[PDB]
């Protein structure tokens, strides 16, 4: 006897949709299906990360394993009618799927050729609410580099320190850092999670147990386990990037400031996206112009009592920060026109953003 199971469509759909994500080589487009001890396990991989789902089998079944094309199998199950029962068995080099008077014969590859992580070794473990992991990632994801030759910047730093978990991302022009308490005393550890691993982790956050290994990270969410390889390299130390004594503090409403930058941006250079800030007593003026010599000017009431200053920014990087802040009022901390600015929620220091200016 070979692998055989019968399952309700709605017990299979969401597990199948999730494992079909991290999928190149032919067997890497397949899911590994394994039936053992009343459980169907489904695994997808791209050789660097892996997603496993477990599904309880409440109908009779026979143990075994195969691999089957992942998107086809998912699309077949999704396309069957609501409430359908799905029967699966192996027939030679094919997997036969039956439901009602529908039949599908899919090509298989042997389970024995499916990749597996063989040297897993855990080094730190903790649990935290899914919403906390999601805040940490959403607070910083947009500042990761994209296809930088400095490979370690294309991912996200995850760091444990004290009772806090921290994420850091930077692309050399801007940096984001966010720290959240998790109520457990943690060893100090820092690892770099690749971009595609961050994306997959987010797909799962719909509590979370995390294990950080020597060369991999693992997340347990309900009946799913996600594993990703870590990135080698020395990630930069955000503590050395934060401005040292940004004495000049400007506070403004986040909505009004964002809306003003967004309007000014319309008439900025399409390639370089530069806008000019002029800070004066309780006032901010934003100006933009382009090669057509069009000009935008916005004047806002703000809270500011420092020296007058003019400073240039890539407006896209500024808007990225304001959109990631979920706050009523924003604090910009300035030093001079050629030094980075620190931006934060006026009422919370959980996250900080550092943006380098452009020369005027």
């Amino acid at each position: 006897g070979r692998m055989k199971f019968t399952v309700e469509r709605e017990h299979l759909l969401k597990p199948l949709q999730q494992v079909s994500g991290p999928l190149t080589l032919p067997i890497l487009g397949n899911l590994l299906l394994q039936v053992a001890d009343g459980t169907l396990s489904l695994t997808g991989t791209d050789l660097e990360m892996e997603m496993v789902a477990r599904v309880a089998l409440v109908q009779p079944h026979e143990p075994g394993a195969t691999t089957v094309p992942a998107r086809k199998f998912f699309d077949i199950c999704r396309g069957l009618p609501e409430g359908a029962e799905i029967a699966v068995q192996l027939e030679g080099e094919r997997m036969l799927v039956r439901s009602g008077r529908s039949r599908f014969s899919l090509s298989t590859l042997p389970a024995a050729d499916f990749p597996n992580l063989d040297d897993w070794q855990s080094e730190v473990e903790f649990t935290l609410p899914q919403a906390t992991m999601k805040r940490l990632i959403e607070a910083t994801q947009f500042s990761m580099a994209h296809q930088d030759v400095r490979y370690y910047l294309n991912g996200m730093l995850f760091e444990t320190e004290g009772e806090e978990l921290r994420t850091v991302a930077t692309d050399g022009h801007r940096l984001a850092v966010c720290s959240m308490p998790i109520g457990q005393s943690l060893p100090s550890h820092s690892v770099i999670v690749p971009r595609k691993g961050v994306i997959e982790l987010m797909r799962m956050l719909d509590p979370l147990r995390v294990q950080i290994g020597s060369n991999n990270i693992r997340a347990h969410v309900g009946d799913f386990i996600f594993t990703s390889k870590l990135v080698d390299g020395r990630f930069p130390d955000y503590r050395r990037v934060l401005p040292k004594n940004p004495d000049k503090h400007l506070e403004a409403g986040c909505d009004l400031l964002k809306q003003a930058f967004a309007r000014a941006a319309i008439l900025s250079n399409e390639k370089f996206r530069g806008v000019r800030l002029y800070v004066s007593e309780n006032q901010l003026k934003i100006t933009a112009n382009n090669p057509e010599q069009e000009e935008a000017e916005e004047i806002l009431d703000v809270t500011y009592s420092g020296a007058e200053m003019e400073i240039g920014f890539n407006v896209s990087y500024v808007l990225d920060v304001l959109n990631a802040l979920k706050c009523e009022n924003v604090r910009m901390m300035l030093t001079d026109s050629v030094s980075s600015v620190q931006i934060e929620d006026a009422a919370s220091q959980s996250a900080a953003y550092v943006v380098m200016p452009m020369r005027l």
Binding site: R150, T170, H173, L175, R240, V241, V338, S340, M356, R359
Partner: peptide, 10 residues
């Protein structure tokens, strides 16, 4: 277009 003081790379 100066960079943040990333070491190395700026």
């Amino acid at each position: 277009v100066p960079t943040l003081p990333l070491v190395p790379x700026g």
